[PDB]
């Protein structure tokens, strides 16, 4: 059996204030965790995650099959050709257990210039009827902005950790244009649990989602208190303990590109567990045209042999590749 991964709990509350020394001591902890397993829990983050979990459970448990087709992304409903990212991702009973609802920046409205131009990766969110889900759309849009504020503070900590000014990433992470997404994922309890919805790793571990790196700058994740994640380290796959009070943070592959793999995007996977639970990631994406020049914090001159890559190019190519590698969610 499997060793516990080192995933420290880091009090991120100084990243919201003006005590610069204290912010540097948090940045050192972020640097250490990014160089070790690649994961940490952010604690003292200020978000009401119990209420997030309760509002998400009331949505998942009350939405009906009719509403799921009406919200479905194009992979499930050919009539919704504009919904590639945002909307409902249906389960397939007997075959695929997980189901989810994704939404994007609430400022992507019909009049937004990138929506008018039909720019890839930008979509107008879709929502269930307000009378059937009272308060849900308002709650979820407010949650987007709560977790955007936490993510901006975390990006200040990452910037300081890499030897940069605290706005080095945050200046590209803006309310009018971020490509960040929230996904409200339901993993169900099922009796019996269909074998077709269970994958098997080469080491024999039963999985709900195979190994991958995230397509993100960073990922800011709330999960229920049911252990399920594992991280590949030099000593093999190790279990990430659950903590339903903190946010689990890790880097995505855009951070690995920008830092020339100094902060790796850690490879991780989701064990199969027959439990009713929630996985609620926020993928911190930049704007479509955002380009950060790659650098290397292990080299004296900081220079890297990597080409600049716009975030829009990164994101479009990565979302397709992850579907190809690990299946349509
Ligand atoms: C420990 S993986 C986190 C979560 N999985 C996901 O959120 C999955 C696997 C990627 S990490 N998300 C995805 O990558 C699917 C689409 C990305 C998103 N819909 C978007 O367009 O921004 C899960 O299975 O618990
Ligand atoms: Fe992931």
Short mmCIF file of C-alpha atoms and ligand atoms in Angstrom, two decimals:
data_model
loop_
_atom_site.label_atom_id
_atom_site.label_comp_id
_atom_site.label_asym_id
_atom_site.label_seq_id
_atom_site.Cartn_x
_atom_site.Cartn_y
_atom_site.Cartn_z
CA UNK A 1 0.00 0.00 0.00
CA UNK A 2 0.64 3.55 -0.78
CA UNK A 3 2.65 6.33 1.05
CA UNK A 4 1.07 9.74 2.01
CA UNK A 5 2.18 12.64 -0.17
CA UNK A 6 3.70 15.73 1.51
CA UNK A 7 1.10 18.36 1.00
CA UNK A 8 1.69 21.22 3.46
CA UNK A 9 -1.01 23.54 4.77
CA UNK A 10 0.05 27.12 3.97
CA UNK A 11 -1.73 30.10 5.64
CA UNK A 12 -2.21 32.36 2.63
CA UNK A 13 -3.92 35.19 4.50
CA UNK A 14 -0.82 37.50 4.29
CA UNK A 15 -1.22 37.52 0.49
CA UNK A 16 -4.38 39.60 0.95
CA UNK A 17 -2.58 42.31 3.03
CA UNK A 18 0.29 44.77 2.92
CA UNK A 19 2.94 43.12 5.12
CA UNK A 20 5.62 42.45 2.51
CA UNK A 21 7.94 40.32 4.68
CA UNK A 22 5.08 38.14 5.70
CA UNK A 23 4.14 37.74 2.02
CA UNK A 24 7.72 36.62 1.30
CA UNK A 25 7.53 33.95 4.00
CA UNK A 26 4.35 32.60 2.37
CA UNK A 27 6.08 32.73 -1.06
CA UNK A 28 8.91 30.59 0.34
CA UNK A 29 6.39 27.94 1.42
CA UNK A 30 4.81 28.00 -2.06
CA UNK A 31 8.28 27.63 -3.61
CA UNK A 32 9.06 24.65 -1.37
CA UNK A 33 5.81 22.86 -2.10
CA UNK A 34 6.10 23.58 -5.87
CA UNK A 35 9.63 22.08 -5.92
CA UNK A 36 8.58 19.00 -3.86
CA UNK A 37 5.27 17.17 -4.71
CA UNK A 38 3.72 20.13 -6.43
CA UNK A 39 0.66 20.36 -4.17
CA UNK A 40 -0.29 22.36 -1.11
CA UNK A 41 -3.44 23.25 0.81
CA UNK A 42 -4.28 26.96 1.07
CA UNK A 43 -5.79 27.61 4.44
CA UNK A 44 -7.19 30.88 5.96
CA UNK A 45 -8.41 31.65 2.46
CA UNK A 46 -11.60 33.46 3.50
CA UNK A 47 -14.04 31.59 1.28
CA UNK A 48 -17.19 29.95 2.72
CA UNK A 49 -16.64 26.50 1.29
CA UNK A 50 -19.36 24.87 3.38
CA UNK A 51 -21.93 27.09 1.69
CA UNK A 52 -20.32 26.43 -1.73
CA UNK A 53 -20.75 22.72 -1.06
CA UNK A 54 -24.34 23.07 0.09
CA UNK A 55 -25.44 25.20 -2.86
CA UNK A 56 -23.68 22.83 -5.29
CA UNK A 57 -25.37 19.76 -3.67
CA UNK A 58 -28.80 21.42 -3.94
CA UNK A 59 -28.13 22.02 -7.69
CA UNK A 60 -26.73 18.53 -8.49
CA UNK A 61 -29.46 16.76 -6.63
CA UNK A 62 -32.36 18.71 -8.03
CA UNK A 63 -31.49 19.12 -11.69
CA UNK A 64 -33.59 16.80 -13.89
CA UNK A 65 -32.76 14.84 -17.07
CA UNK A 66 -34.81 17.32 -19.09
CA UNK A 67 -32.74 20.26 -17.82
CA UNK A 68 -29.47 18.40 -18.42
CA UNK A 69 -30.26 18.01 -22.15
CA UNK A 70 -31.31 21.64 -22.30
CA UNK A 71 -27.95 22.77 -20.82
CA UNK A 72 -25.77 20.12 -22.50
CA UNK A 73 -22.47 20.86 -24.24
CA UNK A 74 -22.19 19.91 -27.94
CA UNK A 75 -20.55 16.51 -27.18
CA UNK A 76 -24.00 15.48 -25.80
CA UNK A 77 -26.38 17.65 -27.81
CA UNK A 78 -25.70 18.44 -31.47
CA UNK A 79 -28.16 21.40 -31.36
CA UNK A 80 -25.73 23.33 -29.09
CA UNK A 81 -22.84 23.95 -31.46
CA UNK A 82 -21.65 27.07 -29.51
CA UNK A 83 -21.25 25.12 -26.25
CA UNK A 84 -17.89 23.58 -26.32
CA UNK A 85 -16.78 24.44 -22.71
CA UNK A 86 -19.77 25.87 -20.80
CA UNK A 87 -22.82 23.80 -19.84
CA UNK A 88 -23.77 20.36 -18.65
CA UNK A 89 -21.63 17.19 -19.12
CA UNK A 90 -24.01 14.24 -18.71
CA UNK A 91 -23.35 10.92 -17.09
CA UNK A 92 -24.12 7.81 -19.06
CA UNK A 93 -25.68 5.32 -16.57
CA UNK A 94 -24.04 1.89 -16.89
CA UNK A 95 -20.96 3.51 -18.55
CA UNK A 96 -19.81 6.88 -17.28
CA UNK A 97 -20.53 7.83 -13.70
CA UNK A 98 -19.29 11.39 -13.35
CA UNK A 99 -21.34 14.42 -14.44
CA UNK A 100 -20.56 18.11 -14.23
CA UNK A 101 -21.57 21.70 -14.95
CA UNK A 102 -18.95 24.16 -16.22
CA UNK A 103 -19.24 27.95 -16.43
CA UNK A 104 -16.83 30.66 -17.53
CA UNK A 105 -16.34 34.39 -16.83
CA UNK A 106 -19.71 35.99 -16.17
CA UNK A 107 -18.45 39.06 -18.13
CA UNK A 108 -18.56 37.01 -21.34
CA UNK A 109 -21.91 38.48 -22.33
CA UNK A 110 -23.36 38.71 -25.81
CA UNK A 111 -21.87 42.18 -26.29
CA UNK A 112 -18.35 41.24 -25.13
CA UNK A 113 -15.85 41.93 -28.01
CA UNK A 114 -14.46 38.37 -27.89
CA UNK A 115 -17.97 36.87 -28.00
CA UNK A 116 -18.88 39.17 -30.93
CA UNK A 117 -15.69 38.02 -32.75
CA UNK A 118 -16.48 34.32 -31.96
CA UNK A 119 -12.97 33.89 -30.58
CA UNK A 120 -12.20 30.23 -29.63
CA UNK A 121 -12.51 29.31 -25.90
CA UNK A 122 -14.92 32.23 -25.18
CA UNK A 123 -18.60 31.38 -24.65
CA UNK A 124 -21.68 32.88 -22.99
CA UNK A 125 -22.68 30.85 -19.96
CA UNK A 126 -25.88 28.83 -19.91
CA UNK A 127 -28.00 28.55 -16.74
CA UNK A 128 -30.98 26.52 -15.55
CA UNK A 129 -34.33 28.16 -15.08
CA UNK A 130 -34.32 30.59 -12.12
CA UNK A 131 -37.74 29.31 -10.82
CA UNK A 132 -36.43 25.73 -10.67
CA UNK A 133 -33.04 26.69 -9.10
CA UNK A 134 -33.70 29.91 -7.17
CA UNK A 135 -30.53 31.84 -6.33
CA UNK A 136 -28.22 29.37 -8.10
CA UNK A 137 -26.98 31.56 -10.96
CA UNK A 138 -26.37 34.51 -8.51
CA UNK A 139 -24.58 32.24 -6.09
CA UNK A 140 -22.40 30.69 -8.78
CA UNK A 141 -21.42 34.03 -10.35
CA UNK A 142 -20.54 35.41 -6.93
CA UNK A 143 -18.48 32.24 -6.27
CA UNK A 144 -16.55 32.90 -9.50
CA UNK A 145 -15.53 36.29 -8.15
CA UNK A 146 -14.72 34.92 -4.60
CA UNK A 147 -12.39 32.28 -6.03
CA UNK A 148 -10.96 34.78 -8.58
CA UNK A 149 -9.96 36.96 -5.59
CA UNK A 150 -8.30 33.99 -3.81
CA UNK A 151 -6.54 33.03 -7.08
CA UNK A 152 -5.23 36.60 -7.57
CA UNK A 153 -3.73 36.46 -4.06
CA UNK A 154 -2.18 33.04 -4.78
CA UNK A 155 -0.68 34.39 -8.04
CA UNK A 156 0.99 37.16 -6.03
CA UNK A 157 2.58 34.40 -3.88
CA UNK A 158 3.78 32.45 -6.93
CA UNK A 159 5.25 35.57 -8.50
CA UNK A 160 7.19 36.46 -5.34
CA UNK A 161 8.29 32.77 -5.03
CA UNK A 162 9.87 32.99 -8.53
CA UNK A 163 11.85 36.17 -7.79
CA UNK A 164 9.36 38.50 -9.62
CA UNK A 165 7.22 41.51 -8.56
CA UNK A 166 3.93 40.43 -7.07
CA UNK A 167 1.85 41.45 -10.13
CA UNK A 168 3.91 39.36 -12.57
CA UNK A 169 1.06 36.86 -13.22
CA UNK A 170 -1.85 38.84 -11.73
CA UNK A 171 -1.55 41.64 -14.29
CA UNK A 172 -2.66 39.12 -16.95
CA UNK A 173 -5.52 37.80 -14.80
CA UNK A 174 -8.28 40.31 -15.17
CA UNK A 175 -12.06 40.26 -14.67
CA UNK A 176 -12.89 41.55 -18.15
CA UNK A 177 -10.99 38.85 -20.01
CA UNK A 178 -9.92 35.82 -17.95
CA UNK A 179 -10.51 32.42 -19.55
CA UNK A 180 -10.80 30.81 -16.07
CA UNK A 181 -13.53 28.21 -15.53
CA UNK A 182 -15.41 26.71 -12.63
CA UNK A 183 -16.46 23.10 -12.90
CA UNK A 184 -19.00 21.61 -10.47
CA UNK A 185 -18.29 17.87 -10.67
CA UNK A 186 -20.56 15.27 -9.12
CA UNK A 187 -19.06 11.82 -8.44
CA UNK A 188 -21.99 9.58 -7.47
CA UNK A 189 -22.49 6.69 -5.07
CA UNK A 190 -23.85 3.79 -7.20
CA UNK A 191 -24.98 0.35 -6.12
CA UNK A 192 -23.94 -1.59 -8.13
CA UNK A 193 -21.11 0.51 -9.57
CA UNK A 194 -20.65 -0.33 -13.23
CA UNK A 195 -17.28 -1.76 -14.12
CA UNK A 196 -17.34 0.14 -17.41
CA UNK A 197 -17.08 3.41 -15.47
CA UNK A 198 -13.97 2.20 -13.61
CA UNK A 199 -10.59 2.43 -15.24
CA UNK A 200 -7.57 0.41 -14.19
CA UNK A 201 -4.01 1.89 -13.94
CA UNK A 202 -0.96 -0.08 -15.02
CA UNK A 203 -0.23 -0.65 -11.30
CA UNK A 204 -3.71 -2.12 -10.75
CA UNK A 205 -5.23 0.92 -9.03
CA UNK A 206 -8.90 1.45 -9.79
CA UNK A 207 -9.46 4.96 -11.20
CA UNK A 208 -12.17 7.35 -12.14
CA UNK A 209 -9.76 9.59 -14.20
CA UNK A 210 -6.35 8.68 -15.55
CA UNK A 211 -2.99 10.41 -15.08
CA UNK A 212 -2.64 13.90 -16.46
CA UNK A 213 -1.19 17.34 -16.02
CA UNK A 214 -3.67 20.19 -15.68
CA UNK A 215 -4.37 22.65 -18.49
CA UNK A 216 -4.06 25.78 -16.38
CA UNK A 217 -1.63 28.28 -14.90
CA UNK A 218 -2.68 27.01 -11.45
CA UNK A 219 -5.69 25.00 -10.29
CA UNK A 220 -7.57 26.00 -7.12
CA UNK A 221 -9.68 23.00 -5.99
CA UNK A 222 -12.30 22.39 -3.32
CA UNK A 223 -13.22 18.69 -2.70
CA UNK A 224 -15.31 16.79 -0.25
CA UNK A 225 -13.65 14.99 2.68
CA UNK A 226 -13.24 11.66 0.81
CA UNK A 227 -9.66 10.73 -0.07
CA UNK A 228 -9.17 10.05 -3.80
CA UNK A 229 -6.28 12.00 -5.42
CA UNK A 230 -2.81 10.65 -6.03
CA UNK A 231 0.35 12.42 -7.20
CA UNK A 232 3.27 10.80 -9.08
CA UNK A 233 6.56 11.47 -7.31
CA UNK A 234 10.05 9.94 -7.67
CA UNK A 235 8.91 7.40 -4.99
CA UNK A 236 5.84 6.44 -7.03
CA UNK A 237 2.19 7.45 -6.76
CA UNK A 238 1.32 8.82 -3.31
CA UNK A 239 -2.06 9.65 -1.73
CA UNK A 240 -3.11 13.25 -1.24
CA UNK A 241 -5.03 13.52 2.01
CA UNK A 242 -8.44 15.14 1.78
CA UNK A 243 -9.18 18.44 3.58
CA UNK A 244 -12.63 19.89 2.97
CA UNK A 245 -11.73 23.11 4.77
CA UNK A 246 -8.82 24.19 2.51
CA UNK A 247 -8.23 24.60 -1.21
CA UNK A 248 -5.81 22.16 -2.89
CA UNK A 249 -3.47 24.12 -5.17
CA UNK A 250 -1.16 22.87 -7.93
CA UNK A 251 0.49 24.18 -11.09
CA UNK A 252 -0.67 23.47 -14.62
CA UNK A 253 1.38 23.04 -17.68
CA UNK A 254 1.46 26.72 -18.56
CA UNK A 255 3.40 27.40 -15.31
CA UNK A 256 5.78 24.54 -16.20
CA UNK A 257 6.34 26.14 -19.64
CA UNK A 258 6.95 29.64 -18.23
CA UNK A 259 9.41 28.38 -15.54
CA UNK A 260 11.15 25.84 -17.83
CA UNK A 261 9.88 23.09 -15.54
CA UNK A 262 11.28 24.61 -12.37
CA UNK A 263 7.66 24.44 -11.11
CA UNK A 264 6.49 21.25 -12.74
CA UNK A 265 2.87 20.57 -13.50
CA UNK A 266 2.51 17.48 -11.26
CA UNK A 267 1.09 14.32 -12.80
CA UNK A 268 -1.92 13.16 -10.82
CA UNK A 269 -4.95 10.89 -11.12
CA UNK A 270 -8.31 10.28 -9.42
CA UNK A 271 -8.87 6.93 -7.64
CA UNK A 272 -12.23 5.23 -7.93
CA UNK A 273 -14.16 5.56 -4.67
CA UNK A 274 -17.84 4.51 -4.41
CA UNK A 275 -18.98 7.65 -2.55
CA UNK A 276 -21.28 10.59 -3.28
CA UNK A 277 -18.82 13.52 -3.40
CA UNK A 278 -17.86 16.81 -5.06
CA UNK A 279 -14.82 18.00 -6.95
CA UNK A 280 -15.12 21.82 -7.64
CA UNK A 281 -12.00 23.05 -9.48
CA UNK A 282 -11.28 26.63 -10.61
CA UNK A 283 -8.80 26.58 -13.46
CA UNK A 284 -6.81 29.81 -13.37
CA UNK A 285 -6.39 30.80 -17.03
CA UNK A 286 -5.13 34.14 -18.33
CA UNK A 287 -6.54 36.17 -21.21
CA UNK A 288 -6.54 35.00 -24.83
CA UNK A 289 -3.70 37.25 -25.89
CA UNK A 290 -1.70 37.03 -22.64
CA UNK A 291 1.94 36.10 -23.27
CA UNK A 292 4.48 35.80 -20.60
CA UNK A 293 8.10 35.46 -21.71
CA UNK A 294 9.48 32.15 -20.52
CA UNK A 295 12.32 32.22 -18.05
CA UNK A 296 14.42 29.83 -15.95
CA UNK A 297 14.98 30.61 -12.18
CA UNK A 298 17.75 28.00 -11.99
CA UNK A 299 19.97 29.83 -14.55
CA UNK A 300 22.13 32.83 -13.63
CA UNK A 301 20.82 35.00 -16.51
CA UNK A 302 17.25 33.69 -16.12
CA UNK A 303 17.07 32.80 -19.83
CA UNK A 304 15.15 29.88 -21.21
CA UNK A 305 15.30 27.99 -24.55
CA UNK A 306 11.42 27.90 -24.75
CA UNK A 307 9.36 29.96 -27.37
CA UNK A 308 6.70 32.41 -26.01
CA UNK A 309 3.22 30.91 -26.19
CA UNK A 310 -0.02 32.91 -25.98
CA UNK A 311 -2.43 31.67 -23.39
CA UNK A 312 -5.23 31.32 -25.94
CA UNK A 313 -3.03 29.06 -28.12
CA UNK A 314 -2.03 27.07 -25.07
CA UNK A 315 -5.59 26.67 -23.81
CA UNK A 316 -7.23 25.72 -27.13
CA UNK A 317 -4.55 23.10 -27.88
CA UNK A 318 -4.54 21.75 -24.37
CA UNK A 319 -8.29 21.26 -23.90
CA UNK A 320 -8.42 19.22 -27.12
CA UNK A 321 -5.42 17.11 -26.14
CA UNK A 322 -6.72 16.31 -22.70
CA UNK A 323 -10.07 15.10 -24.23
CA UNK A 324 -8.07 12.97 -26.70
CA UNK A 325 -5.84 11.48 -23.97
CA UNK A 326 -8.32 10.93 -21.13
CA UNK A 327 -11.77 10.90 -22.73
CA UNK A 328 -14.72 13.28 -22.99
CA UNK A 329 -15.83 14.16 -19.37
C1 LIG B 1 -7.75 15.86 -9.93
S1 LIG B 1 -8.39 16.33 -11.58
C2 LIG B 1 -9.74 17.46 -11.16
C3 LIG B 1 -11.12 16.99 -11.64
N1 LIG B 1 -11.10 16.88 -13.10
C4 LIG B 1 -11.39 17.88 -13.95
O1 LIG B 1 -11.73 19.01 -13.59
C5 LIG B 1 -11.24 17.54 -15.42
C6 LIG B 1 -9.92 16.82 -15.68
C7 LIG B 1 -8.96 18.11 -15.91
S2 LIG B 1 -8.05 18.39 -14.37
N2 LIG B 1 -11.26 18.79 -16.16
C8 LIG B 1 -10.90 18.88 -17.45
O2 LIG B 1 -9.74 18.98 -17.82
C9 LIG B 1 -12.02 18.83 -18.44
C10 LIG B 1 -12.28 20.21 -19.15
C11 LIG B 1 -11.47 21.48 -18.68
C12 LIG B 1 -12.64 22.51 -18.43
N3 LIG B 1 -13.97 21.84 -18.65
C13 LIG B 1 -12.39 23.83 -19.24
O3 LIG B 1 -12.83 23.93 -20.49
O4 LIG B 1 -11.80 24.73 -18.64
C14 LIG B 1 -11.60 15.64 -11.08
O5 LIG B 1 -11.76 14.65 -11.79
O6 LIG B 1 -11.73 15.58 -9.77
FE1 LIG B 2 -6.31 17.59 -12.60
#
